[PDB]
Amino acid sequence: MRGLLVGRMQPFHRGHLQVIKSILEEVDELIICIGSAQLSHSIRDPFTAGERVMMLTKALSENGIPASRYYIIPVQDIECNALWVGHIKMLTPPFDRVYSGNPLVQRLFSEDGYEVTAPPLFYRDRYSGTEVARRMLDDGDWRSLLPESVVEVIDEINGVERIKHLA
Amino acid sequence: MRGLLVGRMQPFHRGHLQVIKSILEEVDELIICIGSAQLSHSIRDPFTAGERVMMLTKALSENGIPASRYYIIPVQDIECNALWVGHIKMLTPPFDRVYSGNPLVQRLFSEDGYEVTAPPLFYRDRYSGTEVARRMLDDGDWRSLLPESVVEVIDEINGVERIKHLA
Amino acid sequence: MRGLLVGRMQPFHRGHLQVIKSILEEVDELIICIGSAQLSHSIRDPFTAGERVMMLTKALSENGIPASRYYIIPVQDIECNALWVGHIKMLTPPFDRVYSGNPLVQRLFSEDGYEVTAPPLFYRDRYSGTEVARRMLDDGDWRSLLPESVVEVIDEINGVERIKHLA
Amino acid sequence: MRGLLVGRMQPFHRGHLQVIKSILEEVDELIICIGSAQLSHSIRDPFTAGERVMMLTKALSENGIPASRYYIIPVQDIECNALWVGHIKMLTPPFDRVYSGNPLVQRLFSEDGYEVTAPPLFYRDRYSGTEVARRMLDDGDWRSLLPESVVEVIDEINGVERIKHLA
Amino acid sequence: MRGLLVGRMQPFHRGHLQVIKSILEEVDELIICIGSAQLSHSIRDPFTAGERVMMLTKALSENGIPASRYYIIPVQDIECNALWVGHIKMLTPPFDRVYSGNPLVQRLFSEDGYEVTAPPLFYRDRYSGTEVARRMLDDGDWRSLLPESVVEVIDEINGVERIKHLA
Amino acid sequence: MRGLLVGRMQPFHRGHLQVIKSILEEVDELIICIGSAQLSHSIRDPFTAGERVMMLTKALSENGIPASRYYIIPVQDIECNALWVGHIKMLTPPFDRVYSGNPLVQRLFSEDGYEVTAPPLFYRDRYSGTEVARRMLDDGDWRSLLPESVVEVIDEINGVERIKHLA
Numbered sequence A, B, C, D, E, F: 001m002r003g004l005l006v007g008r009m010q011p012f013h014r015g016h017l018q019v020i021k022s023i024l025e026e027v028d029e030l031i032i033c034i035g036s037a038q039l040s041h042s043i044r045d046p047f048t049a050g051e052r053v054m055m056l057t058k059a060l061s062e063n064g065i066p067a068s069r070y071y072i073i074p075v076q077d078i079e080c081n082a083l084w085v086g087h088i089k090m091l092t093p094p095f096d097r098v099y100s101g102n103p104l105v106q107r108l109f110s111e112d113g114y115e116v117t118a119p120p121l122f123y124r125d126r127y128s129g130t131e132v133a134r135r136m137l138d139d140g141d142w143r144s145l146l147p148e149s150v151v152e153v154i155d156e157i158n159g160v161e162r163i164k165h166l167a
Ligand SMILES: NC(=O)c1ccc[n+]([C@@H]2O[C@H](COP(=O)([O-])OP(=O)(O)OC[C@H]3O[C@@H](n4cnc5c(N)ncnc54)[C@H](O)[C@@H]3O)[C@@H](O)[C@H]2O)c1
Pocket: A006, A007, A008, A009, A010, A014, A015, A016, A019, A034, A035, A036, A037, A076, A077, A078, A079, A080, A081, A082, A084, A099, A100, A101, A102, A104, A105, A119, A120, A121, A122, A123, A124, A125, A127, A128, A129
C-alpha cells in the first residue's frame, strides 16, 4: 500500500509534518512529491528543490520516520493540467491513494480514477507557507511554525536574508 | 561528505550497483540522479523515471544498503549543457565529489570547479545498458547482467515485451 | 474566400455561434481556431481542446452548418506575441480575413498586414465565458447562454462538477 | 464508434488514402491527427501542418468522403513518450480504436489500454513519404504516388522547389 | 573592467541613459542585456527585442558613447530563477560588476558571488517605463521622458498606435 | 542599407571573417546573428554564445572594422523552421539583404520574401568549423585557420582542453 502526497513545501512546516505522520498510519510508504520544483527565489516559492529536499530529509529523519518508508521526488510543473497526473505517474513508483487539500490536485486525480483523501487540517491558521513567509518578513515568530531541523537549514542557507531582499 | 552519481540507469544493472558500492566506501551519502528522466519507450531509454526509481529502490534495499545513505532524484535533461550543472545543483542537496565515466558530465563539472572521479569499470563489456537491451531483443541472457530485484521489476512491468515491440 | 476566427470557446456559447453565423454570410469557409488549447481545469479555461472540439462539432452540426464550410484547429499558446500570427499561419490553411474582438489579436494581425474585422457583439452582457462560469458556480441559469448540444456535452463530461470542485 | 489515425502525412499519399478508406468501413468517424505538426522544411518533414491540412481536405473531399465523417487535428510532438497518449486525448474527441503501423504508437496506446489495429499495407514499396521525397529530388515520377488534389497543392505551394533547395 | 546592466528597456528612457553614463565612468565597457527579450505587444512590454536594440543603438550613439564601449545582448527569460545568472553568463562576455536596482536581480547575482551595485535613481518618479506607457495612453507628455532618438524610433514603428490598441 | 549574416561561429574563423569583409563592401551595417546560442560543449558546437561574442568582438575589432558597423546578436534555435525567420526579425533591427550559404536558411528567408545572397566561398576546404575541430583533436595546425585574436580567446578559455575531453 503506497500513498502519494504532493506539496510545494515552501518551506516544509509542522503542518506538512503532522499530516505526513497521519498518512504513515494507514499506508506502508508515502511518495512525497516536491511540486513546483523549478520555482525558487520568490516570496511564494523561495527555496530550490534541492534545499527543500534537505528540509524534508532532516525533518523526517530527526522525527524518527525511517527513510525506507518514503520517497522524495522533485517534480517541475507543466503547462497542461490535463497531463499533470500522467506527469507524476511517469516520475514516481506506483501508488494507490492520493492525499491533498488542493482542489485542482484532488479533481485531476479524481478524473483519473484515483481515490483522493483530503487529510485533516492541523492549525491551517498558523501552519501555512503564507504565514511562515509573512512572519519572516515582519520579524514575527516563524521558527515556531517549523520543525527544528527545518529552521537549521533555513539558517544555513540564509533563507530569511534572501526572502527579505526579495520583498 | 556527500558524493553525486549521475546515470540514466536504463536499466539499473550490476555495473551500476558495484560502482555505487565502491563510492559508498569513501562517502557518507550518495546522491543518485536518474538522468534523462523525461525519456522512455525507446530502445536506448525504455523505462520511465518512476520505473527506474523502483529498480534502484529494490536493488539497493535488497543489497542491504541503508536508505538513509542515498537520495534518488529524477532529473530531466535541458537544452543548454552550459546550465546543466546548475540544473543538478538546484534539484539536489549539497555535494563535494562527482562520480562519472561520462566525458561530458566530467568536463562540465570540472569547468564548474568540482572534483570529478571516474570510478573503475566493472566488466564494461557485459555490464552496459546497450548490452542489456541487445540481449533482451535477441533472446540472450540479460537476467545475468542485472540485480535480481531489477529483473523482477522488468518482469512486473513487461519490459521485454515493450522493448521488443519497439524494435 | 476563407476567413479566420480565433477563440478560447470556454465554453462555446450562443455569442460564439451567432458571430460564426454572421461570418459565414460573407465568407465561403471559416477557420475556427480553438486558442489556448493547452489550458484546461481552471475557472477561466475549464475544458480541454478535445472537449471543446466536440462542443463546436455538435453545435455547428446541429445548427445545420455544413462541415465542409469550416475547419476546427486547436492552437496552443506560445511565449512570443511577435510570432503568434506566424504560429497560426503555420497550422492553418490560407485565409484572407480575420475576425476578432480581442485587441491583441486584432493588433497582431494588423501589424502583419491582414484586414481585421471586429464582428458585432451579440448580448456581450450574458453571452460571455465569464458569465457562463459565473452562473455554473452560483447555480444560475447557464444552460440558456449555451447551444443545447453544448449543454449536453458539458453534462456528459461533468463540466459543472469539475468547475465547482475547482472554485 | 470513433477511430483514431495518427500520421505525419509528409505528404498525404495514396497509401494514406486507401487505409483511411478501409477504416471508414468499420468506424462511423475517423479522427485524423497530423503528427509532428511543428516540423516543416526538412527532407523528412517538408510541409507545414497548415499545408498538410489542405492536402487532406482536398483529397478526402475530392474522394467523396463526407466532411462530417472525420476530424483533422494537428498535433505537435512532446518530449515524453510517456505522456504522448494523454497529449492526444487532451486535444481530440473520444475514440474507441486506434489505427497505426508505427510500433511506438501501437505500444504506447496498448500500454494505455486501447485496442490497436495495424491496417493492411497498400504498396508500402512505393506509397511511402520516403519514396515520394526520393522521387521529387531525383526527378522521378512522384505524382503517381499521390492523390491528384495533393499534387495540385504541392504545385501551388512550390513543394518540389522547396525540397530540392533543402537537399 | 567590464560591468553588466540588465534591463527590459520598455522603452529605453532618460533614466536608463543617465545610469548607463554613470556606469561608464567607473568601467571600461558595459554589457547591456535587454531582458525579457521574448515579450512584446503588452502594455508592460510593448516593444520587441529588435526594436529595443534600435532604441539603445541610436540613443547611445547619438549621445556620443562609442560603440566599442558596450555590448547589446537580448536575453529571453527562463522558468528557473536559480539558473538565470548562469543563463546570462552563458550568453555574455566575462564581467566583474553587476548594476541593478531590481531586488531579484541583485539577490541572484549576490548568491552567485558577484558584487552588485544599485545605481543612484535619476528621477524615478517620471523616468520609469510605467510612467512612459501611462502618458502614451493618456495623451500625456511622454516624449520628455525619452531620448530624442528613442522618440524617433517609437514614431517610425508606430509605438503609440500599438500601445493604445492594446489598452 | 543593413544586411544580415547568420552563423554558428563554432568557432569564428578566417572564412567567416573574409565573408564579413566582402559584405561590408556592399552594405552600411551587418547584423551578425550567432545562431544555436543555446548549444555548447559538443564537438560540433563547443563554445558558448558568450565566448563566441568575445571571439567576434576581438577579431572584428583587431581587423579595424568599426564597432558601429555591425550588431552581434545571439539567437537560440526554435523547434519550428516555419517561425524561424520571424524569430530572427523579432530579435534584430530591420534588414534588407540576407547572406548565407546554408540551404535551409536561404530557403526560409526566400519564402519570406527576402533577397538572399550566397557569398563566395573562401577556402571552404580548410576554413570550416568541422576542419578546425578536426585539427584541434588530432593535434593538427588549427591556429592557421583562425584569426589571431580568436586563437587567443580559445587559449584563455581552454578550448582545446575542453574539446579533447569531450571526444
Ligand atoms: N503543472 C501542473 O499542471 C499542476 C497541476 C496541479 C498541481 N501542480 C502542483 O502542485 C503543487 C502545489 O501543491 P500545494 O499548493 O498544495 O502545496 P502546499 O505545500 O501549499 O500544500 C501541500 C499539502 O499540505 C497540506 N497542508 C498544508 N498545511 C497544512 C496544515 N496546516 N494542516 C494540514 N495539511 C496541511 C495541503 O492541504 C496539501 O495537501 C505545485 O507544485 C503545483 O505547481 C501542478
